[PDB]
Write a protein that binds this DNA or RNA. Structure first.
Lengths: 108, 203
RNA sequence: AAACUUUCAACAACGGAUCUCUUGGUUCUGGCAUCGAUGAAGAACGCAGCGAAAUGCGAUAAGUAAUGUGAAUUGCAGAAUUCCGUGAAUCAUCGAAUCUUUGAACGCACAUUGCGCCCGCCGGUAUUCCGGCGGGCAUGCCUGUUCGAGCGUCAU
RNA sequence: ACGAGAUUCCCACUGUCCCUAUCUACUAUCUAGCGAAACCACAGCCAAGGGAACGGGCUUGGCAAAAUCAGCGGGGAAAGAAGACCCUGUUGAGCUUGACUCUAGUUUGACAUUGUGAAAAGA
RNA sequence: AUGGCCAGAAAGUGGUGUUGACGCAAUGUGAUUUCUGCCCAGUGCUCUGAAUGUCAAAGUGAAGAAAUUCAACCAAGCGCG
RNA sequence: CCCACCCAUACCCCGCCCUCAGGGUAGAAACGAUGCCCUGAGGAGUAGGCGGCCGUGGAGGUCAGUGACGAAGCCUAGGGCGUGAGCCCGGGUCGAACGGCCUCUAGUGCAGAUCUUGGUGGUAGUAGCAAAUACUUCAAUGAGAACUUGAAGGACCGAAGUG
RNA sequence: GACUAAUCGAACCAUCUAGUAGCUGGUUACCGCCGAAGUUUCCCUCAGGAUAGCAGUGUCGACCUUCAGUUUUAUGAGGUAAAGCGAAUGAACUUUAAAUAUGUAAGAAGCCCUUGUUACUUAACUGAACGUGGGCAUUCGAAUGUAUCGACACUAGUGGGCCAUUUUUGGUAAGCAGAACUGGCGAUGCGGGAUGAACCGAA
RNA sequence: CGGGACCGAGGACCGCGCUCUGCAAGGAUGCUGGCGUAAUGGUCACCAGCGACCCGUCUUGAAACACGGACCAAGGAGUCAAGGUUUUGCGCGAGUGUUUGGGUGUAAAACCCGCACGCGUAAUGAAAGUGAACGUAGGUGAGAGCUUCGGCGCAUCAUCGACCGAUCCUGAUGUAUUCGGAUGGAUUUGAGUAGGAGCGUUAAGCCUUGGACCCGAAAGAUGGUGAACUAUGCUUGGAUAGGGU
RNA sequence: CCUAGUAACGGCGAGUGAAGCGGCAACAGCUCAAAUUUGAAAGCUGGCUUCGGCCCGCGUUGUAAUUUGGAGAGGAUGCUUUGGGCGAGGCUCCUUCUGAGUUCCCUGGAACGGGACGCCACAGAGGGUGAGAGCCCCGUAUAGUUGGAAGCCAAGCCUGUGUAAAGCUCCUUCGACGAGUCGAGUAGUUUGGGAAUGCUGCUCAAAAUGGGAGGUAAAUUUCUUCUAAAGCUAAAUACCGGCCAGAGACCGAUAGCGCACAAGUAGAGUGAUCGAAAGAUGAAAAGCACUUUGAAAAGAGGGUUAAAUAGCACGUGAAAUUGUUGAAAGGGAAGCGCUUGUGACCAGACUUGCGCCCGGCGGAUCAUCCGGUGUUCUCACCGGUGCACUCCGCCGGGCUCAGGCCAG
């Protein structure tokens, strides 16, 4: 607003390669770390899994349905078996899922 | 990074007519619905999968049903655009799944279709009888025949005994091996051809 | 002391600020698609009882017909209106008309109210002369009609 | 020869001068009528001092009496002087040249327009 | 004169030109009288005189699987004379 | 060399204003706590920086706001408040609207720009109204006659004319 | 370089166009709180730049740690005056020792001792550095002062100006020209120098 | 022990005290007179004593010079948009943003809806690509606050480690025997990880681009209008005593 | 909208800058050329008509039907499909018509102002009327209601039926598909496509699973996508022109368009062009009868008006500047600051209040108790009770205190 400006108070005193035709959809691969993996599970069933009311069943998480292509490996997982379906995975993320007792499945 | 070095003031478009244009569009839609009643305001559309690797996870509505979809659903291609079905002769069915889904979609529409006779006093055998002509109708095919599951379910529960064993060597190693084989497909072919030529020469 | 000059005040001048007003601008939004050889846009010249302009109109000239309304117009003059009506009005609407000289502008021209041509009709003694009136006469192109030209190709 | 071209001199001639005087008409002047403009921070007596070489206003003195008229050209004002001159420019423009980059014109070659026959010399 | 000097964006365009060397065009000097210091040959002016020396595009030959690369030939002008 | 005396916005004491600093203030008889009470220090200012206030046109809310028994505007050697920009009142004039408070908003505050438009002074009853030879008498008209008319006189153009 | 409608080294009209200027002019109420600056250091200069320094608003951190244009003390520079040479020797002599300002240092965040290593160094496990452990709080180890802290953020002017004292280097016939510190002024009123940028008193 | 001047802030009590029936002890009362109105006080005009350059601009260090100002009224110059940046307020928070659009409406308002999308949640490398826990998310020294008084230690700072990517060296088990790239080192590096802080909006300052605070050039370009003046030419007209040689 | 200020382009860098995907608004598809109707030019402009047709022609150097790549042509096969005429009713546009105070009092020239009493309201938007009007007038709201015209949509209902045309299913076979064009070189220009863009000119100039594209030049081998060189087509989109309409935190006569007015006018310029200034009496002209003085303009009386302190110079009527009247100052400037004085002119303050003691009046809203009610639950109010040594006012005195200005 004009009445708050300092002008009113001053009244009276004045490399590398080139890539032709880049298509960004080629390089679409959003990533998620394993320390956010359980947040993709809905809250109620996640709470039952973390408490220990589901001892004979394992969750299957489709990352592409959530919009992620690569599972990265920051953090740690609880000792609950999880099946993860992903287009890409890092070696540490696969190692931590295997120690948790699940499996990383590859999809396209 | 301000691009104001041309005579930009001659080409400024403001949008004060935004609510007026919404009102005009709504009046046009109401007029179109009144002209089309009791038909729905829109045409039936097939379900297609988006291109590129970024969007092939999601399905959406396409332009029109294919000729092979119409043939497998039993709707002639001259009848289909007269009963509210969009037709696309350019799209092909490369796989069975999309073809089957769109054929089932067409069959559900044909099962829910009420076809009034051209002459009321002379109904035909392909026409809906008068004592079935009265039922609750929909006027929005985009709503009543929308995309129910655009994405796959992101969560699924299985028993611990049904956990897959996993590919041998690990998923990361499988990805690395697939990339390596794709990069070395031609080198190995050339080496095999040279070995075969040497074996033929010195057999 | 007055006069003069200057200061202060009242009233009166000069001038048109201030305040209030606003049949006008400005900006936005919504709707609509309709100029012209069937002569447009523009220009000129005229037209009212009494007008120079603005407005309206075209020698049927501040207008005619038609439809509607239903008693004015008004500055003056003069007339109204059978008011129980084919009817006032600088009224509204508007489907029928009129629409001067021009202008893309079209007989040829135009710095000329210049000069023609074709066909009718009327009047003046009139087969010959004179006058008036009416209808016509641009260019490019298309379809068609008709009259033609050329050893250009042929038949006989 | 000719010249409203530039220069020196001689005779004649005279108010150019010694050395100024006088006369006439129209003004200026005074009156009636009519009636501008330029310009204008405020104003208008001087002397000495007022570091920046400048005072009209300050300091210290001289002094100093209404309202006016004709004249005058010291000062202030007054020159389309915001001129002219000098200095500066990311200066503007006209002009010149083997300055730079281009170009009209001109000139040279090739392709096309471009066809029908000969005679040779090479493939 | 299938020319010179001009003009025009171009044209089946125009001018000079209703012209033709006693003419047309471009320069310099500037009536008459006087008047051409002496001798060349550096710049310039002009010579189709021999050269390929420089040497564009098109064209020609070679290598390569091709893109391409390498070679000669090479107008006018310049150079040389 | 000596004694007294003169006065600066300096120094001392006192009052008042502002700023900064440090304290107090709820089993609230309790306060524009954004207040009040106690104490101390400090006070020039260009470029520059920051805060708070005043004023103008318009908008929402509010004041059961003012007004033909006189709104706004204007004049005033008439008063009151504020350090100040300003605010309020009296008297005169006048004729139709306007103001306070909290927010919102801006084409929002002038002495300058050889500023723009309009209006008005001094100069000043001044400069001036001096080329083209020149006017005079009587009568009439009229409110009024050098510059209207008739007559009577005097002149000028001078035929490349004032025809 | 004349004339082409008072317009000519390129007419007039409208438009692009509110063309561009670093140059000139101007730029609109009040009170309150702070408040400046002129080679510091680097870059090819003039038709040059940055930059330090100096300022204001916000915050935040335990506004914790104390620090200081000052004296004293130890020790440098200035040994330079001076006293004596019945001290030795002879400003260059010294037992001793100037004035003026001036450098460095003056604690627990410190001082040492010991342990080892060394890729330093030393003849060298020798010094030093690196760490390790221990001892020292009995006085925390001069004076005076201490509303003086620190760190960020953002914003602004000025950043090769004038005069003067002192010191120092050069000069001129005489004038004077460079540096360094400090003070004043540009930004500033008051009292006195009759008067006034540079004087005295005092803000 | 006298003589004189200026001043009286505060507003129940509380305190320090003393000469203690009380007081000069944390700030003036008591007594009396005239007048009760223009008498005091105030405004305006003028005289008197003392004081006192004409404003604005420009310049440099400053003056001086120079420029603008006859007078008055009204008009008159840091604005708006886009994009950054820092700071303030607000909502939500690992998310955040309804308003392109749709629904709806008392109709340009208000209310409601969600797919996609933007920004953030991951970095690094030219790229292919790879991609953040040894440990109560580490050790040590500080550190507000809390404490069971033994300690625990926020934010932040300092310092030593660890993890991801890039670069260089070594090259394990294996094997499409030529692929694969573990392990172990070494440098710098990145606003990288190491118990998320962002997104939207409001307000202010500043920066960039637009006419960009306002007025001012000589200019450049595009398209038009003039030979009634004047210059030259063409066609057709007109005009110029009397003397001398 | 997003992609995205991204990929990319760029002297000496200032700068420039798309597209695919994705969400949405809106959606709509088709016509030729290339085939022999060949058992029948089945096609068409024009002229004349007795409205039945008949002529003059066009055209085979090709007018109809059929086919257009999604196909189609030929076969096979058995089922499906169709043409006309009414039409209830609805919508669009002009037309007739719509509620309630001019009730009473005051101010006023005039109520539309103030006060009182009503009424209407699906209407309290706006305007007019002698001052702020829901009810005085036009209009405004809502359903409708009169009369007329032209279109569109449409529930249904009558009828002819297969000469012909049309769709579906399968198939050995056949399956024409646009040339100085595509493409290449070169030149100019253009683009983010200055290695990957488009356009145009000149030269060369194609092909038949061929051709184009697949953003780094080339050869070889593949693959994926379309099918150029012929053509038509609503909507969502633009809009400083035109016509009609509704609005605004816009401007309020130096503003706002140059123009609120006989404004693109007057006026200027040979011409192209340039281009203003300028709104407001009063509710109503009631715009001054009549007398008088002047040649007249006018003046003075007297009138109109609510007001001429509104007189066609006209609402209000500032300042500069001027005249008169009153006061004052002035020996080569005035103006200004501090402080007295003189003269002129003013604002306040004050006028008495409170509290006692007596006397005289006028009344019982004294205290206590009872009942009801309310509250803060122990405080109040209301009704009865007081019978005047108690309360509450008034009037006379007396006393204390506090009161204005200047002083000792």
């Amino acid at each position: 607003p004009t009445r708050f400006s300092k002008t009113r108070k001053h009244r009276g005193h004045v490399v590398g390669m080139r890539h032709f035709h880049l298509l960004r959809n080629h390089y679409w691969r959003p990533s998620i770390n394993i320390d956010k993996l359980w947040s993709l599970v809905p809250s109620d069933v996640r709470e039952q899994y973390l408490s220990g009311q589901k001892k004979d069943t394992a969750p299957v998480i489709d990352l592409l349905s959530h919009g992620y292509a690569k599972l990265l490996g920051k953090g740690r997982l609880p000792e609950i078996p999880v099946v993860v379906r992903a287009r890409y995975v890092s070696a540490e993320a696969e190692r931590k899922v295997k120690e948790a007792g699940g499996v990383v499945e590859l999809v396209a | 990074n301000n691009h104001f070095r041309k005579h930009w003031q001659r080409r400024v478009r403001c949008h004060f007519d935004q609510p007026g244009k919404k009102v005009t569009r709504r009046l046009a839609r109401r007029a179109k619905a009144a002209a089309l009643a009791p038909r729905p305001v829109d045409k039936l559309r097939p379900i297609v999968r988006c291109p590129t690797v970024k969007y092939n996870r999601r399905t959406r509505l396409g332009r029109g049903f294919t000729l092979e979809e119409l043939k497998a659903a039993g709707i002639p291609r001259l009848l289909a655009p007269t009963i509210g079905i969009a037709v696309d002769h350019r799209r092909k069915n490369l796989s069975e799944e999309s073809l089957a889904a769109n054929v089932q979609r067409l069959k559900d529409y044909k099962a829910r279709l009420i076809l009034f006779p051209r002459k009321s006093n002379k109904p035909k055998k392909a026409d809906t009888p008068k004592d079935q002509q009265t039922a609750e109708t929909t006027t929005s095919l985009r709503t009543s025949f929308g995309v129910e599951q655009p994405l796959a379910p992101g969560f699924t529960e299985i028993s611990k005994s049904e956990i897959p064993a996993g590919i041998e060597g690990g998923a990361y190693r499988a990805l690395r091996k697939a990339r390596s084989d794709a990069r070395l497909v031609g080198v190995r072919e050339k080496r095999a051809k040279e070995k075969a030529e040497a074996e033929a020469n010195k057999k």
